[PDB]
C-alpha cells in the first residue's frame, strides 16, 4: 500500500520578486494548486508565470493557479535539474487533495494496482454508428 504525503504548510518558498501572472480571483472562490519539491542547492529556475526565481536549499513551496503550470514546473525540474516533486489541489474551504504522483511512482511507469478505466477493448473502427445511438446523450465511443 501507498500513503500520500501531507502538505506541510510551513514550507519555505523560492526567492522571487513578484509577478503579474500569479494567483488571481479564481484562487479565492474556486481553486489554486501548489507544488512542493526538494532542492539540493540554491539555484535559479524559470517560473511558469514568467520571470526567474531562485529556489533555496531544502524544501521549496510554490502555489500556482492551474495544475498545468505545476506540471510544467515539475517537468522542467525533472529534466533540467533531476528533481522530483509533489503537487496538491487546495480548495478554499480548507480541504487539500493530493494530485500528480498519486500512487508514488510516475504515471509513465507501471505500478500494478491502478484503475484501468477508460480503456475500451475494441478498435477505433469498432464503435457504434451514430444512427444506432440516436437521441441518446452519449457519443459512440462511451458505450
Amino acid at each position: 500500500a501507498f500513503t500520500p504525503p501531507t502538505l506541510q504548510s510551513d514550507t519555505p518558498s523560492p526567492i522571487f520578486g513578484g509577478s503579474t501572472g500569479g494567483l488571481l480571483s479564481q484562487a479565492q472562490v474556486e481553486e489554486f494548486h501548489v507544488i512542493t519539491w526538494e532542492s539540493k542547492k540554491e539555484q535559479i529556475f524559470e517560473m511558469p508565470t514568467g520571470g526567474a526565481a531562485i529556489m533555496r536549499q531544502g524544501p521549496n513551496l510554490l502555489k500556482l493557479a492551474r495544475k498545468e503550470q505545476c506540471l510544467a514546473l515539475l517537468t522542467q525540474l525533472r529534466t533540467k535539474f533531476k528533481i522530483d516533486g509533489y503537487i496538491y489541489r487546495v480548495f478554499p474551504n480548507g480541504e487539500v487533495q493530493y494530485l500528480h504522483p498519486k500512487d508514488g511512482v510516475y504515471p509513465e511507469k507501471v505500478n500494478a494496482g491502478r484503475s484501468g478505466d477508460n480503456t475500451n477493448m475494441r478498435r477505433i473502427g469498432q464503435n457504434k454508428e451514430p444512427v444506432q445511438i440516436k437521441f441518446s446523450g452519449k457519443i459512440p465511443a462511451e458505450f
Partner: protein, 731 residues
C-alpha cells in the same frame, strides 16, 4: 447558470461560451437532452406554424405600410412616372437636407422608394385601392393569429399527432400535390378570372359585387358542355391599355404567348389558363399514392422495384423509403435543393418573362428581385448540401443502406471528388487564362489578338427557339418546320415577336464575353459543388480522420498531430463553400447587372467589347457605375443616394470585420482576454463589480461562423447598395 435548459452540458459552462453556444444550438432539437422522436416532430410542426405566422405577418406589414404611407393610388394612375413608396421614414437623426432629399414620390415626409416590386404585383393581381390593401393586411393578420392558435393547439396532448402520422408519406404527398398545390392553383385561377381579368379591363370587381358580375358572357355553359374554346374567343388586342376598357375583350383563358405591348408583361389570361392547367395536373398527381381507399401507390414498393438487373446500381433503391422517411435531414436536404433550384428558376424567369404589369420598365426593381432570388438560391443550396452532410454524419445507417445507390456513391466517392476537382481545375485554368490573355493583348494595344470563342451552342439553342439572328434556320427559326407549323395559330406569333425583339429580356443576344462569363459561372458552380460534395462524402471519415462520424458534424479540429487537422469537419467544408457560393452569385449578378445596364442605356456595345477582358469589368462596370453611389454624400452636400453610399461603406466595414475573425485565430485573443481579466480583477474602483460568466475567447467553430456571417452580410449589403444606387440613381 441554467439558461440553456435544452443542454445541461452547456449550462455547466462557467464562461461566456455557455450563452454563445446556447444561442446557436437552440434549434438543434435532435441534440437536446431528453428528446424523443415524437417530441421532436411535434416541436418541428409547431415551429412550422410559427414560421408561417411570421411570413404572414411580414406580408401583412408590407400591405399595411403601402396602404398607410405608400403612393399606391398615385402609382396605379401613372405606373411609369411615379416612384413606388415602401414606407415612411421617422428617424430623429436626420438633418434638414436629409429630410428634403428623402421626400420623393409626392409624400408628405421622407419615404423609401420601394424596389421589392410589390406595387407591380399588387397592381397586376387586381388591387387598385389602399382600402383593398388594408383589408388584405387585416385578413392576413387574422389568419396569422389563427395559425399561431393552431401551433399552440397541436402542442396540446389532446391534439398532438402521432409520430406515425408525421411519417405517413403517401398521404402527405397526396394532399400536398392535390390540395396545397392543385386546389390553391385552381383558387388562384378563380381569383384571376373573377377579379384580375375584369380589373385589368377597367371593371371593378370586389366582395360587394363579384356575385353580380359575369366573368364571361356565356357563363359555365361552355365549361359544362365541353365547348371550352368559347373561353378564348376575343383576346385583348395589341392596342389594349391596362386598367381601362379600351380595346379589351371577353376571353378569360387566352393562349397567345409573348408579352402585353403596353405593360411589357405576360397576358393575365395566359396566366389564368396556365394556373388552371397546373391545377388540373397537380390534382391528378395528388391522386397517385395509396392512403386508406384501397387504390394508389406504396412508394416503398416503387423504390424496391427500381433495381436494374446485372447489378448496374447494386441493390438499386433498396430501403431508400425508410432512409428518406426516418431522416429529417435527408428530407430537409432534398427540400432545400429543390427550393433553391426553384428560386434560381424564379430569378431566371421573371427578368426574361416579366409577369407583373409595368415590370421591366422599373429597372431597379428587376435587378433587385433577380439578385435577391439568386443570393437566396445560393444560400439555400449550400444549406441543402450541409444538411446532406449532416444526414451522412447523423442519420446514415450502412446496414439498411447496403448495396443501394447511397452505398454505391459512398463507395467510389474518391472518383466523384477527383473528377469535380478536374472539372473545376480545367474551368479555372482556361477561363482565367483566356481572360488574362485578353487583358494582356488589350493592354498592348492589340484588341484583334483576343481569343473570342463564339458561344455557338447557346446561339444554336436560341435559334431553336425562333431567334432569327444567327442564321441557323433550325427549328422554330424556320417557319416551314413541324414545330413552327404546329403552334403557328397558338403561341408562336407572340413568342416569336418576343424572341425577335431587342427591347426585352427574352433571350438576349450573346457573344464571346457571355461565353467567358458563362465559363466563370460554370467554374463557380463546379468548385462550390466540389467543396460541398467533398464535405458530405468525407463527413463520415477520411484517411486523415477515419473516425470522423463519431466526432459529429461540427467540431474544431483533431489537433496539430498527423501534420495538422485544421478545418477537417464537414461543417468546415460548408464554411469554405459559402465563400465560393458568394463569389459565384457575385459573378452571376455582376453579369446580369452589366448586361442589363448596357441594354437599358441602349449601349449593348459597352458590354460586348468590355466583358471579354477583366479591365473592362473593373473600369466600365465597377468604376463607372459607382460614381453616383459614392457621391451620395460629399462636402458639397447630400442627396437621396446617401443611404446607399452609407450602406456601401457599411458593407465594406462588415466585410473586413469578417476578415478579422477569418484571419486571426483563437489563441492570441485568449491571451489578450486573460490579460484584460487580470487588469479588471485588480483595477481599483472596478473590483466592486465582477463578471458572472468568465470572459473567454470565441471558440474556433464559433468565430469561423462569425467571420462567415460578417463576410456574407458585408457582401450582400455592399452589392445591394451598389446595385440599387447605380440603377435607381440612373433610371
Amino acid at each position: 447558470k441554467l439558461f440553456p435548459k435544452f443542454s445541461q452540458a452547456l449550462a455547466q459552462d462557467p464562461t461566456t461560451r455557455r450563452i454563445w453556444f446556447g444561442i446557436a444550438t437552440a434549434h438543434d432539437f435532435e441534440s437536446h437532452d431528453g428528446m424523443t422522436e415524437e417530441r421532436l416532430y411535434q416541436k418541428i410542426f409547431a415551429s412550422h406554424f410559427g414560421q408561417l405566422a411570421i411570413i404572414f405577418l411580414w406580408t401583412s406589414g408590407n400591405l399595411f405600410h403601402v396602404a398607410w404611407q405608400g403612393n399606391f393610388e398615385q402609382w396605379v394612375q401613372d405606373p411609369l412616372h411615379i416612384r413606388p413608396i415602401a414606407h415612411a421614414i421617422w428617424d430623429p437623426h436626420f438633418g434638414q437636407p436629409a429630410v428634403e432629399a428623402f421626400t420623393r414620390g409626392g409624400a408628405s415626409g421622407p419615404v423609401n422608394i420601394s424596389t421589392s416590386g410589390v406595387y407591380q404585383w399588387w397592381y397586376t393581381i387586381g388591387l387598385r385601392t389602399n382600402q383593398e390593401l388594408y383589408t388584405g393586411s387585416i385578413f392576413l393578420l387574422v389568419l396569422a393569429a389563427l395559425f399561431l392558435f393552431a401551433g399552440w393547439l397541436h402542442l396540446q396532448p389532446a391534439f398532438q399527432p402521432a409520430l406515425s402520422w408525421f411519417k405517413n408519406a403517401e398521404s402527405r404527398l397526396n394532399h400536398h400535390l392535390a390540395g396545397l398545390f392543385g386546389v390553391s392553383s385552381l383558387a388562384w385561377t378563380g381569383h384571376l378570372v373573377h377579379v384580375a381579368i375584369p380589373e385589368s379591363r377597367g371593371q371593378h370587381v370586389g366582395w360587394d359585387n363579384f356575385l353580380t358580375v359575369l366573368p364571361h358572357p356565356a357563363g359555365l355553359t361552355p365549361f359544362f358542355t365541353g365547348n371550352w374554346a368559347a373561353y378564348a374567343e376575343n383576346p385583348d388586342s395589341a392596342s389594349h391599355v391596362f386598367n381601362t376598357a379600351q380595346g379589351s375583350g371577353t376571353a378569360i383563358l387566352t393562349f397567345l404567348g409573348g408579352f402585353h405591348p403596353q405593360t411589357q408583361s405576360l397576358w393575365l389570361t395566359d396566366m389564368a389558363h396556365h394556373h388552371l392547367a397546373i391545377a388540373v395536373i397537380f390534382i391528378l398527381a395528388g391522386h397517385m399514392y395509396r392512403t386508406i381507399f384501397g387504390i394508389g401507390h406504396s412508394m416503398r414498393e416503387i423504390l424496391e422495384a427500381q433495381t436494374p438487373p446485372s447489378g448496374s446500381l447494386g441493390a438499386g433503391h433498396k430501403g431508400l423509403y425508410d432512409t428518406v422517411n426516418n431522416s429529417l435531414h435527408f428530407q430537409l436536404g432534398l427540400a432545400l435543393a429543390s427550393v433553391g433550384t426553384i428560386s434560381s428558376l424564379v430569378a431566371q424567369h421573371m427578368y426574361s418573362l416579366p409577369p407583373y404589369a409595368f415590370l421591366a420598365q422599373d429597372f431597379t426593381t428587376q435587378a433587385a428581385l433577380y439578385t435577391h432570388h439568386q443570393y437566396i438560391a445560393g444560400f439555400i443550396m449550400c444549406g441543402a448540401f450541409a444538411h446532406g452532410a449532416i444526414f451522412f454524419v447523423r442519420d446514415y445507417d450502412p446496414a439498411q443502406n447496403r448495396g443501394n445507390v447511397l452505398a454505391r456513391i459512398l463507395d467510389h466517392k474518391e472518383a466523384l471528388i477527383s473528377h469535380l476537382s478536374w472539372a473545376s481545375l480545367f474551368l479555372g485554368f482556361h477561363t482565367l487564362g483566356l481572360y488574362v490573355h485578353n487583358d494582356v493583348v488589350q493592354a498592348f494595344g492589340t484588341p484583334e489578338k483576343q481569343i473570342l470563342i463564339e458561344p455557338v451552342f447557346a446561339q444554336w439553342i436560341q435559334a431553336a427557339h425562333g431567334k432569327t439572328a444567327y442564321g441557323f434556320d433550325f427549328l422554330l427559326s424556320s417557319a416551314t418546320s413541324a414545330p413552327s407549323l404546329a403552334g403557328q395559330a397558338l403561341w408562336l406569333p407572340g413568342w416569336l415577336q418576343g424572341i425577335n425583339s431587342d427591347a426585352n429580356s427574352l433571350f438576349l443576344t450573346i457573344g464571346p464575353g457571355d461565353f467567358l462569363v458563362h465559363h466563370a459561372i460554370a467554374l463557380g458552380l463546379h468548385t462550390t459543388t466540389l467543396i460541398l460534395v467533398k464535405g458530405a462524402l468525407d463527413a463520415r471519415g477520411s484517411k486523415l480522420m477515419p473516425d470522423k462520424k463519431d466526432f459529429g458534424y461540427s467540431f474544431p479540429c483533431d489537433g496539430p498531430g498527423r501534420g495538422g487537422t485544421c478545418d477537417i469537419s464537414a461543417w468546415d467544408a460548408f464554411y469554405l463553400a459559402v465563400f465560393w457560393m458568394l463569389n459565384t452569385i457575385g459573378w452571376v449578378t455582376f453579369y446580369w447587372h452589366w448586361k442589363h445596364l448596357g441594354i437599358w442605356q441602349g449601349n449593348v456595345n459597352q458590354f460586348n467589347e468590355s466583358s471579354t477582358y477583366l479591365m473592362g469589368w473593373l473600369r466600365d462596370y465597377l468604376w463607372l457605375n459607382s460614381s453616383q453611389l459614392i457621391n451620395g454624400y460629399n462636402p458639397f452636400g447630400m442627396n437621396s443616394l446617401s443611404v446607399w453610399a452609407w450602406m456601401f461603406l457599411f458593407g465594406h466595414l462588415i466585410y473586413a470585420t469578417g476578415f478579422m475573425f477569418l484571419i486571426s485565430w483563437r489563441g492570441y485573443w485568449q491571451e489578450l482576454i486573460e490579460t484584460l481579466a487580470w487588469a479588471h480583477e485588480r483595477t481599483p474602483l472596478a473590483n466592486l463589480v465582477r463578471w458572472r460568466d468568465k470572459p473567454v475567447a470565441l471558440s474556433i467553430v464559433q468565430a469561423r461562423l462569425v467571420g462567415l456571417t460578417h463576410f456574407s452580410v458585408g457582401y450582400v449589403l455592399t452589392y445591394a447598395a451598389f446595385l440599387i444606387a447605380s440603377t435607381s440613381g440612373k433610371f
